[PDB]
């Protein structure tokens, strides 16, 4: 196990032993009041491609 008494390098658990963490990345919804989703996603519909 990785998070233990100095037992680093867990072979099957690569995403800890490597250095791939999300430092400041939270993920949850409802950041915005709802209908800006409407007013802005129905506004950037045209130019939403490459």
């Amino acid at each position: 196990k990785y998070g233990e008494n100095s037992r680093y390098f867990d072979l099957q658990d690569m995403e800890n032993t490597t250095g791939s963490w999300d430092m400041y990345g939270v993920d949850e919804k409802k950041r915005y009041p709802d209908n800006q989703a409407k007013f802005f996603t129905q506004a950037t519909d045209i130019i939403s491609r490459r």
């Binding site: 690569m14 400041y24 990345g25 993920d27 989703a37 130019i47 939403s48 490459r50």
Partner: protein, 159 residues
Amino acid sequence: KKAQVISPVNGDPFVGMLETPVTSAPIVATYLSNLPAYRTGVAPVLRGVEIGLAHGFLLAGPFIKLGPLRNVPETAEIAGSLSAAGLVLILALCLSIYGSAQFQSTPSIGVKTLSGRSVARDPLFSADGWSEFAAGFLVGGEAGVAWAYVCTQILPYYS
């Protein structure tokens, strides 16, 4: 004496970062969690318009105060705002071609959070998400610079 503040990242002294009250202080951590570039659960279009609204409104200023049309009255604001809109346009183009060059191949393998649990990958880091983010940036930036002109024209003791 049995007191220490500075620590390596999540134990693990062999990743090239070390934790400091600059990086991992609580108020700083919650602050940079709450910024729009780190939210991961919202659609990238909306982040694009938030970031664009902010950056356009700040970019309008220096062209107004320090541009070559800054002493001629009543038209010093126009040339500044127009130039700032031009800069935002070029930033939108840069975002588009960055999307064309960066996410053009396979993504990475895995991601976990700091207090370990397997969080999924941010949808901003695909081609579609980045292109949508660029469109949001264009809309938000132009709206922001237009608001900068509006805010100049009707504001109590602007000078």
